[PDB]
Write a protein that binds this ligand. Structure first.
Ligand SMILES: [Zn+2]
Ligand SMILES: [Zn+2]
Lengths: 604, 258, 52, 434
DNA sequence: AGGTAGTCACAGCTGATTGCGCT
DNA sequence: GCGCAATCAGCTGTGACTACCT
């Protein structure tokens, strides 16, 4: 509250430092938790904090977590009660809980189970234990449109009433503003109305303890609740979804991002679920393997939310699909859920549990907050540092090596400002030489190399100069698949170029070296995804930027997610043996010739 | 950040020192103790962080021995003098045992070094070495225990230096050669302190800088299982690797194991 | 040509972060390393292409 | 500056007088290199000089540079002196006084360094080691606050004058409190044992103004260095000049004493360290300090942005702007790195190195940002009609030592403003002589 | 005296057309 | 002549740059 040095000091607020330091935790009045990792009780404190709060940074020594209303909702969703969490937080405080958190925790946890949402006979109902709250929200104008025709009293038994199916998102957004958040609990143990399927995973696909913890938190009291699980791409992500689908034992719907991720999910199901191919169906307008009458359906976005005319067969498939309940609707790459057309997808299908999986939950436009009510609370957030300490995740040695701007290019860079400077620092001759040197070194040491490069116009001359395979992106489907398939099991070729195509969950093979050049501006999601394509110092990835350009600021502002995850970006300013061998653009003649071909765009 | 620990094992066998005293020679046990104390004081003066330990071996057991001069040295010397007086004055010959318990003293030194290593802060490395001065004859009964001690010292990278006074010991030569220590036989006993300060005073890093006498001819004669005597040619079992002086139709050790 | 190669190398390899780093190195320790522990840590934290 | 640098600049007579105290010889010995100590110990019991070649042959050829450095340091400290050995050879033998005092300090002999301690019996108002440490820390914090200028710190006028003499603070106008200079900030950033030693060196340099014997002060300081913590000694047996120095040390917190007339004085932990962790540093440019005193808070806030202040914790963020501001204040990046390394928490000691390389590299790169542009005032000459004429003027300027930059290809040269007049006069004379 | 719908780049998807192959 | 695969139109997501009102 005091600003003697510009720092919020709370010395007087929390003086309960009785005896004496044995509790490795610090609380903040507004809200924050600081955890000391070098403590004998580190594991238990970490388990307690994960179940109640989401992390904000996990460096090697002092973790920092944040307390949010949705985190407390998730905590109270599990068997943890208000008294237990309060007494255990007071147990490990070392400073005393300020009287702004206990009131906040109490207010958040009081209104959890008052309002519930249920699905029955393809109808959405809102049920409340206390009848008074219904009259409390009756005067709200937005809610009154949901009922039709006005739902005079909907006398049952406990007071509940029907709501408009297509306006469920609006009421979900309103309820949290009304301090009456909705809960999505599916008691699949006793339904007797939904036709459960005979899916059963093979008893040979073992899972790691963190996956066990995530699943156990998903099923806390014998029921499944909608949530989000964040795991690295290299780690086991599809396995968690398959296990959840098997445990739910209901008709499963899987949504992917690309037309190739559906094949990935089908392969995962065929590998770890022992499901006959008749029940498995893929609905992506490619083979149409009779999706009508199926147990497990896999499809992708941008197909369930078409606002234009649809195919005749696809129309009938959608009509059939929108006439029955769904069990554990699984969404992949949940981070790009809050979109103009992707949000309505959850409103176009009916499901009991909505499970979202992703590796990079960070996104711009601050629309991640909407995901709290679109699907549910952030359930699990894996700790990447301890994950790679166990050896199951490759310990990637991050590097941020920059190159000076050549004199023939910096003049043009400072001369132009109307969006024409991207190619100038993208095609820096010094950065080109650094990339070529890294390629040659890691080919001499026999490491698989993936070079990410947006602005495919530059990538053309970047790849044809070295005469190496590249993926333009609008090429074809077979060519990309065959290139990626022969990239792994071929000693002759061990380096590929990707232009914004690998910025999603694909089937790229294991690689040890990743080099990114001229990516998007501040896409922390993109850089985190690119890093995820390497881990699965076993590996290491480099980022090349041009000094005294906007790319420096972009690289600085895009790595904050990874440093929050615990990674450190070493700065490399000199490359050993740069002049030992011959590289391209050795003389100034071709460097100044490059100016004409890089200014030859003239997109006017 | 460089910490050096020196453990000095003193062969305090009463029989050999009594014979030396009866010889009325210029060298006695008192002069040996004084030289050891001076060497310890020099080691402590070399650096502040240097740690010193002194263990005296006797027929009974091993004793942990640890105005105008340094205050800590004055306290250190008094404790060593009191301990050596208490050990020798209260030493009563009870039995026919005469061989020095050199192996037990080395084991205690290793345990003490292991204890001290843990107490060191993780920012510093505790370079440890053991110096042994030998006066009595070597004991062939403790061959296996001595070899185990040598291997344990080698595993933890602890130098073992031997300063033989009268009779060369093959066990000490093997310990010096295996662990990389320095083995030296004293030509003139009264000049012991000068030899200790000239040879064994520098640490391993400093020994590289200096020129030191070449290692003496180290022997590797093995000890028979049924005789506990050094031999050159003997029979060795192919299963348990036990060594026997004479051929036997059946291996005793393999018969013991079931 | 040969002169152009040397000119380009001089411009590139020492543009911003050498005109001061090289001068500092000329005014640096010069002698041997502090301890062997420092060298081991540096080798561990250095990249494979920087150790050749 | 270290002890060896100060000892090297002393006259031989002062060095000879210093060796008369056994404590001084031990302190000098412990400051020697590792190779030098072995040579001193080997020559401890020698009454005859040794040939220089014989001493040189002890060390191997590959390590001859270290041997030469050790020999040069020993010669500079005058521990041993070259002796004219008969036969044309040069013999090396230790100083007899130094050798005798070293043997007394090691083997024993003479009287104790202190007069006596049991003459007055137990102390009526004896303190404890934690109390002594608290008193020393409070005195040091008071001194450092007086360096800042807070009214809560009140010290003697002589201490303020000494600080002014050290250059840390300047008094532009009499009466008004002095202002701390950039050297004051650099000294504050220094480690406490380094700060104590620098202050003591300044005191020794300025002692001749107060008419105090350098040898006696150095001997007493070295004796205090080897004193046992928690054990008092008799004040008596010292000159009245040494009494003022003892009172100054008591004001500095090195030595505790209940009253000026008291016959007892208790050396503190600072006094012992005069002979020679709470900060956790994270890869995300965050400092977690386990401190409560305002001194460490100010020191950290000098080069970082404060975020949170828990009653027993300080959470700060090391940002580019804060480091740039601190460097503009006069603190170099190397000093910041050394300060962070010294105050490193014991947990960080496991990591090798203790400070993560990325943070140190980023700090160093931030330091280089301020001095990216180099500014050198001067006068440019570009009106050379002939190549030969340019070369002669360039050579003359180099002789005068005023040349800043030269370019023979375009016949361009830059001279210092001070040397511009000389070059102009030379050029005028050359044209007249032509 | 200080902030958001068009606009641009680069990818994705699905809904048709549309020339190419033939024991 | 029929059938399969290549191709484009239209719509959308992601991130960043830019011209008029409280
Ligand atoms: Zn035998
Ligand atoms: Zn056998």
């Amino acid at each position: 509250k005091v600003d003697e040095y510009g720092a919020k000091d709370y010395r007087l607020q929390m003086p309960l430092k009785d005896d004496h330091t044995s509790r490795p935790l610090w609380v903040a009045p507004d809200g924050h938790i600081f955890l000391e990792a070098f403590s004998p009780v580190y594991k238990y404190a970490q388990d307690f904090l994960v179940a109640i709060a989401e992390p904000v940074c996990r460096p090697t020594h002092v973790h920092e977590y944040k307390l949010t209303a949705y985190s407390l909702y998730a905590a109270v969703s599990v068997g943890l009660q208000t008294s237990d969490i309060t007494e255990y937080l007071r147990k490990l405080s070392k400073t005393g809980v300020p009287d702004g958190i206990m009131q906040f925790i109490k207010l958040c946890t009081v209104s959890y189970g008052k309002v519930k949402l249920v699905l029955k006979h393809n109808r959405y109902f809102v049920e409340s234990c206390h009848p008074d709250v219904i009259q409390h929200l009756l005067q709200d104008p937005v809610i009154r449109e949901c009922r039709l025709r006005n739902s005079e009293g909907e006398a049952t038994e406990t007071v509940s009433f029907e709501v408009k199916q297509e306006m469920i998102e609006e009421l979900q957004k309103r309820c949290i503003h009304l301090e009456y958040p909705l809960l999505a609990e599916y008691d699949f143990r006793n339904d007797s109305v939904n036709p459960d399927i005979n899916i059963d995973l093979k008893p040979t696909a073992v899972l790691r303890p963190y996956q066990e913890k995530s699943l156990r938190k998903m099923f806390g009291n014998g029921r499944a609740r909608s949530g989000v699980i964040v795991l690295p791409c290299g780690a086991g992500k599809s396995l968690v979804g398959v296990t959840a689908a098997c445990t739910v034992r209901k008709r499963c719907l899987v949504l992917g991002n690309s037309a190739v991720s559906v094949e990935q999910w089908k392969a995962q199901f065929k590998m770890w679920s022992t499901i006959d191919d008749s029940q498995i169906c893929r609905f992506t307008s490619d083979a149409k393997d009779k999706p009508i009458g199926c147990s497990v359906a896999i499809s992708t976005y941008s197909m369930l939310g078409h606002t234009t005319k649809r195919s005749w067969e696809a129309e009938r498939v959608m009509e059939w699909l929108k006439t029955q309940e769904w069990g554990l609707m699984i969404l992949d790459e949940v981070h790009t859920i809050p979109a103009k057309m992707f949000r309505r997808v959850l409103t176009i299908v009916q499901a009991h549990c909505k499970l979202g999986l992703t590796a990079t939950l960070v996104r711009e436009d601050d629309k991640i907050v909407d995901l709290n009510f679109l699907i549910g609370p952030k359930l699990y957030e894996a700790n990447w540092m301890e994950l790679q300490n166990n050896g199951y995740i490759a310990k990637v040695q991050c590097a941020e090596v920059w190159c000076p701007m050549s004199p023939e290019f910096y003049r043009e860079y400072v001369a132009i400002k109307t969006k024409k400077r991207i190619l100038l620092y993208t095609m820096n001759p010094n950065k080109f030489r650094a990339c070529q040197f890294l390629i040659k070194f890691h080919e001499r040491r026999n490491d698989k190399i993936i070079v990410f490069a947006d602005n495919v116009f530059a990538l053309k001359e970047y790849a044809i100069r070295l005469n190496k395979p590249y993926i333009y992106g609008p090429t074809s489907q077979g060519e990309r698949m065959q290139i990626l398939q022969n990239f792994k099991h071929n000693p002759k070729i061990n380096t590929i170029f990707i232009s914004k195509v690998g910025d999603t969950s694909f089937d790229l093979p294991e690689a040890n070296v990743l080099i990114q050049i001229s990516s998007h501006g501040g896409s922390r999601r993109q850089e985190a995804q690119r890093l995820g394509r390497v881990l699965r110092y076993n590996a290491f990835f480099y980022s090349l930027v041009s000094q005294d350009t906007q790319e420096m600021a972009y690289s600085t502002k895009r790595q904050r997610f990874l440093v929050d995850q615990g990674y450190s970006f070493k700065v490399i300013t000199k490359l050993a043996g740069m002049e030992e061998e011959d590289l391209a653009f050795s003389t100034k003649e071709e460097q100044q010739q490059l100016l004409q071909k890089v200014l030859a765009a003239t997109d006017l | 950040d460089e910490l050096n620990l020196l453990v000095i094992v003193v062969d305090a066998n009463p029989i050999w020192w009594g014979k030396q005293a009866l010889k009325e020679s210029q060298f006695t046990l008192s002069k040996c103790i004084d030289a050891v104390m001076v060497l310890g004081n020099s080691h402590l003066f070399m650096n502040r962080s240097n740690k010193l330990a002194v263990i005296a071996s006797h027929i009974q057991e091993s004793r942990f021995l640890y105005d105008g001069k340094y205050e800590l040295l004055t306290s250190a010397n008094e404790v060593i003098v009191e301990e050596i007086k208490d050990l020798m004055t209260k030493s009563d010959i009870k039995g026919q045992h005469t061989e020095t318990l050199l192996a037990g003293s080395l084991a205690k030194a290793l345990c003490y070094i292991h204890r001290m290593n843990k107490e060191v802060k993780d920012n510093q490395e505790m370079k440890s070495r053991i110096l042994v001065i030998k006066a009595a004859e070597d004991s062939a009964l403790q061959y296996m225990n001595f070899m185990n001690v040598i291997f344990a010292a080698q595993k933890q990278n602890i130098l073992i230096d031997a300063c033989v006074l009268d009779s060369d010991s093959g066990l000490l030569q093997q310990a010096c050669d295996i662990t990389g220590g320095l083995y030296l036989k004293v030509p003139q006993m009264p000049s012991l302190l000068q030899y200790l300060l000239w040879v064994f005073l520098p640490d391993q890093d400093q020994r590289s800088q200096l020129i030191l006498p070449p290692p003496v001819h180290v022997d590797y004669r093995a000890a028979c299982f049924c005789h506990r005597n050094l031999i050159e040619i003997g029979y060795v079992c192919s299963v348990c690797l036990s060594i026997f002086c004479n051929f036997s139709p059946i291996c005793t050790t393999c018969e013991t194991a079931f | 040509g040969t002169s152009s190669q040397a000119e380009a190398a001089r411009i590139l390899a020492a543009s911003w972060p050498q005109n001061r780093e090289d001068e500092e190195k000329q005014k640096l320790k010069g002698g041997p390393k502090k301890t062997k522990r420092e060298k081991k840590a540096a080798a561990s934290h250095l990249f494979p292409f920087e150790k050749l | 500056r270290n002890l060896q640098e100060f000892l090297g600049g002393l006259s031989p007579g002062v060095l000879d007088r210093l060796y008369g105290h056994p404590a001084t010889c031990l302190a000098v010995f412990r400051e020697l290199p590792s190779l030098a100590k072995n040579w001193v110990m080997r020559m401890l019991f020698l009454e005859q000089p040794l040939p220089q070649a014989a001493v040189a042959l002890w060390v191997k050829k590959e390590f001859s540079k270290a041997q030469e450095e050790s020999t040069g340091l020993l010669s500079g400290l005058r521990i041993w002196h070259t002796q004219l050995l008969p036969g044309g050879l040069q013999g090396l033998i230790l100083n007899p006084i130094f050798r005798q005092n070293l043997r007394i300090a090691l083997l024993g002999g003479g009287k104790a360094w202190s007069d006596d301690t049991s003459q007055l019996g137990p102390d009526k108002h004896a303190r404890d080691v934690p109390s002594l440490d608290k008193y020393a820390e409070e005195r040091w914090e008071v001194v450092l606050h007086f360096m800042v200028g807070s009214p809560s710190a009140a010290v003697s006028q002589d201490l303020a004058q000494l600080l002014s003499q050290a250059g840390l603070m300047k008094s532009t106008e009499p009466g008004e409190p002095p202002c701390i200079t950039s050297a004051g900030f650099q000294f504050l950033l220094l480690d406490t044992p380094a700060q104590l030693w620098y202050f003591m060196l300044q005191y020794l340099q300025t002692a001749q103004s107060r008419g105090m014997d350098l040898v006696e002060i150095l001997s007493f300081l070295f004796q205090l260095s080897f004193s046992t913590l928690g054990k008092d000694y008799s004040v008596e047996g010292m000159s009245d000049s040494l009494l003022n120095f003892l009172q100054h040390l008591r004001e500095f917190g090195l030595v505790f004493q209940r009253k000026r007339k008291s016959r007892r004085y208790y050396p503190t932990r600072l006094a012992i360290n005069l002979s020679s962790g709470f900060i956790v540093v994270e890869t995300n440019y965050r400092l977690y300090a386990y401190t409560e005193s305002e001194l460490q808070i100010a020191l950290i806030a000098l080069f970082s942005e404060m975020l949170y202040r828990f009653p027993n914790m300080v959470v700060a963020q090391v940002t580019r702007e804060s480091v740039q501001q601190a460097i503009a204040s006069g603190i170099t990046a190397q000093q910041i790195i050394h300060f962070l390394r010294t105050r490193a928490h014991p947990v960080m000691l496991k990591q090798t190195p203790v400070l993560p390389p990325t943070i140190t590299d980023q700090i160093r790169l931030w330091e280089l940002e301020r001095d990216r542009l180099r500014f050198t005032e001067g006068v440019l000459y570009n009106q050379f009609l002939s190549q030969v004429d340019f070369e002669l003027l360039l050579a003359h300027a180099r002789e005068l030592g005023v040349l800043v930059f030269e370019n023979s290809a375009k016949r361009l040269m830059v001279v210092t403003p001070a040397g511009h007049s000389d070059v102009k006069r030379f050029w005028k004379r050359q044209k007249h002589s032509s």
